Design a protein around this ligand. Structure first.
Ligand SMILES: CCC1=C(C)/C(=C/C2=NC(=C\c3[nH]c(/C=C4\NC(=O)[C@H](C)[C@H]4CC)c(C)c3CCC(=O)O)/C(CCC(=O)O)=C2C)NC1=O
Ligand SMILES: CCC1=C(C)/C(=C/C2=NC(=C\c3[nH]c(/C=C4\NC(=O)[C@H](C)[C@H]4CC)c(C)c3CCC(=O)O)/C(CCC(=O)O)=C2C)NC1=O
Ligand SMILES: CCC1=C(C)/C(=C/C2=NC(=C\c3[nH]c(/C=C4\NC(=O)[C@H](C)[C@H]4CC)c(C)c3CCC(=O)O)/C(CCC(=O)O)=C2C)NC1=O
Ligand SMILES: CCC1=C(C)/C(=C/C2=NC(=C\c3[nH]c(/C=C4\NC(=O)[C@H](C)[C@H]4CC)c(C)c3CCC(=O)O)/C(CCC(=O)O)=C2C)NC1=O
Ligand SMILES: CCC1=C(C)/C(=C/C2=NC(=C\c3[nH]c(/C=C4\NC(=O)[C@H](C)[C@H]4CC)c(C)c3CCC(=O)O)/C(CCC(=O)O)=C2C)NC1=O
Ligand SMILES: CCC1=C(C)/C(=C/C2=NC(=C\c3[nH]c(/C=C4\NC(=O)[C@H](C)[C@H]4CC)c(C)c3CCC(=O)O)/C(CCC(=O)O)=C2C)NC1=O
Ligand SMILES: CCC1=C(C)/C(=C/C2=NC(=C\c3[nH]c(/C=C4\NC(=O)[C@H](C)[C@H]4CC)c(C)c3CCC(=O)O)/C(CCC(=O)O)=C2C)NC1=O
Ligand SMILES: CCC1=C(C)/C(=C/C2=NC(=C\c3[nH]c(/C=C4\NC(=O)[C@H](C)[C@H]4CC)c(C)c3CCC(=O)O)/C(CCC(=O)O)=C2C)NC1=O
Ligand SMILES: CCC1=C(C)/C(=C/C2=NC(=C\c3[nH]c(/C=C4\NC(=O)[C@H](C)[C@H]4CC)c(C)c3CCC(=O)O)/C(CCC(=O)O)=C2C)NC1=O
Lengths: 162, 160, 98, 57, 162, 162, 160, 162, 162, 162, 160
């Protein structure tokens, strides 16, 4: 995969060029944001079960058809599948936030997710709603500064699904 | 009519009439005398149908003749009866033609806009047409009554 | 109240609250389009189990009550228009729905 | 045999249209020769009346 | 565009009156001629290609200049146009035969054809001669009763283009 | 779409065979039920608006959250859209009953419907409930045998949505 | 089929079937026994019809089976008769369906291109189907003879 | 894989409704035909090799080029694969008949079979002919009613391939 | 699309209750910046071509490889397409600023943007750099207060791309 | 599309380089073969229907199953579709031979064709065998060098369908 | 190129190339060696052509290199000469291709928008193209100069 540091390194490697002032500026930006990223990652690791808990409850409260009979999340199997997908989404958004890059999201999650969901019959609107649920649930736990950072990765996941 | 629809369908794709269209035209002309007999019976007793249907409609919907209703007043009641007469004449025309194309072309296309302009309650149309259908099917035999009531049914559905 | 029963009373109360909520929403949005469109089809739904005249009286009464509190001529005329749209739509649906 | 100048009026019999459709009803176009047979047939199937056709070139 | 039944419906509807007994007699007439009309229509549908064969042959036999250079049929395209016109005339004549009314001829054949031929320069006399050529042979195949009954539609086309 | 006659024709054409005794027996069975199917279709066209009224009333009574805020029928716009969907289901089930085959249902209703509702947010289970309600409403109006025949196609619609 | 055509015509207008279309279906189902008898007679006589019609075709046009002709040879003659068997089966399909739709969709669309690729003279095919018309209509009664001949004439016009 | 009982169970679980009289009626019908189904399945199992033998003999007699050089069944390998495929079709048709549902055919037999045979080069039409020959052989052994029952599954396979 | 007003109205309509303190606070915040946002929108609408000029100059000065042979912007057509895309981004950012919601961006830019740029081979990182340069220029042009309001939607687009 | 001259132009333009001796040699090679290409294209255009006739005869004689009932080419419509596909293969092979590059083959034939046949159920192996038949029939008419040149593009089509 | 245009034109109507556009291809091919030789002459003399065209442009239009001009400064003059080099190379591509299609796609589609974004005076581009055309036609013989002159004329017209 690729993070901000590796992104700058690869750009300058393909150019065969040297680290200039702009490169060091970007590296300084990432190092400045690093401690916030690490604190947010630790907080999200602490409360991951709680985040999935609350996001699932809210999504199924806003759209109760999913858990009633005839819904895509109606069985123990399909409910557990929904929870498993949301746990992936949280973990990989945390990876992307800590890296500072969304390449991991692309390659590990978004490359093939639309077709998987379309073949499974999984609603994609409801999945985006669940991602937004996780987004604003974790925003409260990480704090406004870290929420502004994790939100872009949650929106990246949502835009990749939509 | 039936032959008109068959000719339109044939000319749509630029060919002579299909064997099936010829069979449907034969079925139409073979039953033309019975259609004309139904036309006899419906045309002759028109007053019975129209007046009995008006009475049944007014009893079913007293608010129509009540003050503030659309049919309130002698002139408005006369217009009610004239509308029922129009629809009976169109139903007889469709019975003759073998299709509901006369009914549709004369008084179905744009009926909702006109009756919106007149504030005429379309449920009033539906109940009046149902009363007309009841009277007409009663005065006819079962084999004729079903076929005739199909046209009243189409008219009621168009109004509804 | 007794003749309808609890269900139709609940429907009636939530519908009056619905009318006033949409009036508030339309004042916010700058357009009474939502009330308009939601009322182009209301009379045919209501008529069998509701009195259209009663609904017109209710909307006029809410118009009077709301106009009372505003105490400003432009405010009064705007809210009066946003209720007159309801009366106008239920009046326009005298024939079938469009 | 190059072009036809055709004036025709196609009315509406299937419904009532809310938009303008005034120029859609009464109009004059120039139609190519290879297309005039099909265009005349279409106008005729629509129920319209071809008022007059002249030869342009 | 209307048959006999819709024509009488129209003429009784415009007056605002119901059908009278004379209307019913006119209707019985068409219902009694219907089977003959359908039989003639089937014969003509079966023999349309042959009728075009012999009609074009006779038309180009009596008038030789048309196929020869300088004639209003001298081209492969123009030959095809002439035979197409004759085929359309035959088909619409059969249509009017089945309907029992000449309204379809006005609405779908003579609608703009007169002035189209006038602008193009098609000779009226040759077209009338071709209509006659088709009619007097088609009457032979369809039988005398149907011959007299296609007579009205064919000479209607001739008089309209005249 | 294809009806019973077309179904038998296709089955015998893909095998390159003429109609045997079984084929004619099946065709005769379909022909015997034609008048009943026509009468049932006329009865349904008689009371289509009625059936929609009772079906929608029963559905919204047993599913009151549909018309409450947060429900997908909570609007006059959404209510009209729901009753128009109900109209679709009744019309196409009547088409299928008249044809004698469930092909028109699969072709024009069931194909792509689940993904359409997933995009729109429409609850599939509530739509199945509405279809069932339409089934009980229609059975009484059409009578016993017509109800069996007509409910076969309602069950096909429900199973396809299920 | 007739039912299919009525259903799709109603579907195009987003309406239920008109009384004319229901009457058309009633007429079509009323003739079911006659159509079944005709189709069963044609199927029972498929070998005889093909044999006799092939004989008539070959005597009328010896050029097809003469050296240098397209049907020359035992295998090409067998293919010739197999085509006639195909078209007879299609005619029976059209008889039971009540319309020429099965014939149209199995053996009429692209037939000119197909037989152009196979160097098959279309006039020969028309003569063959006319021979089949004659042979089959010889077996049927007067009423059913015209009904079968209509589908045969449609197929001939499609080939011509 | 779902049988009639499982289909009823699923169509009632999607609704969330308990069993009512109609479900018990469908289950009772399945138990009514169960004895016929078990006898037919036992007879087919007892004579599977025989059925394959006459079916393959009939197919290769009707199409001798298949087993001659240049035919797709010309090798001991390819002949064995052919009779193996015929055994597949018989066994899975027996499964579907015993379940009373064509689900297993779509589910384990017809899925990707066209692409597989087209990649192998197997003639689809000749496989359908083998299936029809197998149908004819199986019917005489199982009797009239069991033949009518097995015929729907054999025709299902033939229509799925074609 | 949606704006802030539609979002609040829908949020309180699905709950079925009037505006609370948080609602009025959201509307007051949205209205307070309204005149500033309209002034900024007028400036951008008036001076879009200028902003494109400096944004493109900065982008192609920082990455000259784009406009040299072998670069994705090397032709007159591809340079014109690049500046056209930049105009798209500026205009849709202005739309989003005036709306106060990023729904229009998701609906009419992000939906299909990644597919387009990965199909065409457009460098996503360079597009992000161009968007950042556009942000800087438009912020210098419209003032810091409107610069932040532009920058939030510019960042939304940049995060959508990367 | 792209031809040999356009291919060299594009290769040198991406590099930004002027033409050198190797590029001029490639252009000279194309100009040398141009007359042979034109003769072959004219001969093919004169005899396209013939080549299709013998190729189709070969394919349907070696694989008669394709045109018996249940086969992919079994109907007049499907047989015509098959011969139309062969006609298009021949025309685009001629186009590629004239151009000297297979770019038109990709763009106008091979992009999405295998998916289309996979959906339609078309046996791609039999299509490739028909293409090989057209290759050998074309070679005899066009001569040795023209046959090698045409076989290049026929084999390109065959391997592209793979 | 000529072959590309002929083939895509034939493709737009789903037909084989007619003998007229086959004569097209033959005439283009028979002229290949002269085009290659002209491309030789232009490619070998690019360095002299660019310098001479730059001097002619700057003496005819001193304002561009004057203070406040677009080409003012060594770097901007270098960019101008680089653009002249691009267009000379595109002219060579067009000469070998037999048409303006390489010039069209690489340097004509969107050139006005490119230079408008770059704040480049299009009349300056036209003058530069005319000067470089004169310089290039100076090197070539009359028959070849007439051919290359029209490519340069198309470039000038496209920039104008
Ligand atoms: C048909 C298969 C199936 C099952 C069984 C199922 C169970 C299920 N139980 C739920 C909650 C619940 N389930 C329980 C029951 C527990 N409370 C006590 O601890 C007991 C030990 C135990 C019951 C004996 C409770 C109290 C809740 C509410 C929890 C909450 O609302 O957060 C929910 C969430 C409802 C929603 O989101 O709207 C589901 C879906 N779902 C299915 O698709
Ligand atoms: C043949 C096609 C055709 C139709 C059908 C038709 C209907 C029609 N009915 C009218 C009046 C009327 N029609 C009615 C009847 C209705 N109001 C009552 O509520 C009843 C529910 C219901 C009768 C069952 C009444 C009361 C009026 C008088 C309204 C008025 O004049 O303001 C008018 C206004 C002009 C006039 O009366 O001369 C029209 C055009 N016109 C046509 O050209
Ligand atoms: C602002 C936008 C808006 C409104 C107000 C609205 C009203 C509305 N009320 C309904 C129910 C109902 N509404 C009423 C009657 C009430 N209705 C009121 O106008 C009266 C004050 C009152 C009786 C005097 C009743 C009795 C029902 C039950 C269903 C029925 O009438 O059959 C329904 C049908 C859906 C359901 O069954 O719950 C609508 C659409 N819809 C809208 O989109
Ligand atoms: C926006 C400008 C505009 C105008 C003005 C306009 C007029 C207009 N009226 C039409 C039909 C018609 N218009 C009328 C109304 C006439 N009959 C009554 O007695 C009155 C005397 C009179 C009107 C006051 C009628 C009856 C028809 C139908 C005529 C027919 O189709 O036979 C049509 C033919 C198209 C259609 O039927 O939808 C046009 C174009 N269209 C336009 O787009
Ligand atoms: C369905 C009613 C209808 C018909 C039949 C019809 C025919 C028709 N014939 C045309 C030309 C023509 N029409 C004819 C036929 C005539 N010239 C002579 O051969 C004969 C005396 C005579 C035939 C009886 C010919 C030869 C041309 C081509 C002459 C030319 O190029 O100007 C054209 C001009 C457009 C075109 O040919 O593409 C039309 C529209 N149009 C219609 O709307
Ligand atoms: C179900 C619809 C359908 C039809 C109709 C059909 C026709 C058809 N006819 C064929 C050959 C043939 N067809 C004929 C028949 C002709 N010979 C004489 O000219 C007669 C005029 C005429 C018959 C009356 C002959 C002789 C051949 C052999 C051609 C040859 O071997 O070159 C073939 C090629 C079969 C092969 O050898 O691979 C087809 C597909 N295919 C279909 O799927
Ligand atoms: C190249 C690989 C290959 C082989 C080996 C092969 C054998 C083979 N032998 C067959 C028939 C036969 N084969 C035999 C031979 C047996 N008779 C005696 O018992 C002997 C023990 C034995 C021979 C020494 C017989 C008698 C039949 C006729 C079976 C029947 O028609 O009932 C058949 C059935 C199809 C046909 O008759 O054309 C095959 C496939 N096929 C192949 O593609
Ligand atoms: C508002 C919704 C919308 C978007 C977003 C959009 C993007 C877009 N840009 C395109 C072309 C292009 N876009 C670019 C982008 C530039 N390449 C440079 O390297 C930069 C990194 C970058 C901008 C800073 C380029 C080079 C092309 C031409 C690529 C080609 O055609 O080969 C195309 C292909 C269609 C065409 O050429 O007209 C689309 C769809 N179009 C839309 O309708
Ligand atoms: C192959 C297609 C192609 C063309 C044609 C092209 C032209 C082009 N010329 C540029 C700059 C320039 N071009 C010129 C040339 C102008 N100076 C005078 O006014 C004259 C009127 C005119 C030259 C005759 C100048 C002065 C600049 C520098 C302006 C700047 O720094 O932005 C640039 C910006 C990138 C850079 O500065 O290196 C491009 C992209 N690029 C392409 O990919």
């Amino acid at each position: 995969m690729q993070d901000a540091i590796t992104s700058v390194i690869n750009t300058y490697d393909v150019q065969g060029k040297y680290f200039d002032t702009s490169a060091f500026d970007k590296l300084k930006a990432y190092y400045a944001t690093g401690e916030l990223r690490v604190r947010a990652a630790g907080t999200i690791s602490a409360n991951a079960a709680t985040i999935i808990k609350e996001a699932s409850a809210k999504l199924f409260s806003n759209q109760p058809d999913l858990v009633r009979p005839g819904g895509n999340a109606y069985t123990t199997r399909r409910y557990a599948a929904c929870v498993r997908d949301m746990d992936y989404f949280l973990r990989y958004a945390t990876y992307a936030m800590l890296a500072g890059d969304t390449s991991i999201l692309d390659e590990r999650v978004l490359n093939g997710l639309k077709e998987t969901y379309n073949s499974l019959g999984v609603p994609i609107s409801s999945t985006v709603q669940g991602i937004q649920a996780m987004k604003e649930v974790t925003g409260s736990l990480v704090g406004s500064g870290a929420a502004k950072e994790m939100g872009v990765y949650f929106d990246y996941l949502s835009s990749g699904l939509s | 009519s039936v032959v008109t629809k068959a000719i339109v369908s044939a000319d749509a794709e630029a060919r002579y009439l299909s064997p099936g269209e010829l069979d449907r035209i034969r079925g139409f002309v073979s039953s033309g005398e019975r259609r004309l007999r139904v036309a006899q019976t419906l045309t002759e007793s028109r007053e019975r149908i129209i007046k009995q249907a008006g009475d049944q409609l007014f009893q079913k919907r007293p608010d129509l003749v009540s003050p503030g209703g659309n049919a309130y007043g002698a002139e408005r009641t006369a217009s009610c009866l004239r509308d029922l007469d129009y629809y009976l004449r169109l139903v007889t025309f469709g019975i003759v033609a073998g299709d509901v194309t006369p009914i549709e072309e004369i008084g179905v296309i744009g009926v909702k806009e006109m009756y919106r302009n007149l504030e005429v309650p379309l449920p009033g149309m539906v109940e009046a047409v149902k009363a007309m259908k009841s009277v007409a099917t009663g005065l006819l035999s079962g084999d004729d009554s079903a076929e005739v009531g199909y046209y009243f049914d189409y008219l009621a559905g168009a109004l509804a | 109240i007794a003749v309808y029963g609890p269900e139709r009373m609940q429907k009636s109360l939530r519908d009056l609250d619905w009318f006033l909520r949409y009036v508030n929403y339309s004042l916010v949005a700058g357009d009474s389009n939502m009330i308009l469109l939601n009322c182009l089809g209301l009379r045919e739904i209501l008529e069998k189990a509701c009195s259209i005249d009663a609904t017109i009286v209710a909307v006029q009464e809410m118009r009077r009550a709301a106009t009372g509190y505003l105490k400003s001529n432009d405010d009064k005329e705007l809210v009066g228009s946003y209720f007159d749209v309801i009366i106008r739509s239920l009046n326009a649906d005298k024939s079938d729905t469009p | 045999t190059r072009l036809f100048k055709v004036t025709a009026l196609i009315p509406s019999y299937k419904k009532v249209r809310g938009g303008r459709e005034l120029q859609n009803t009464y109009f004059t176009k120039l139609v190519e020769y290879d297309r005039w047979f099909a265009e005349q047939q279409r106008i005729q199937k629509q129920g319209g009346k071809i008022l007059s056709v002249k030869m342009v070139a």
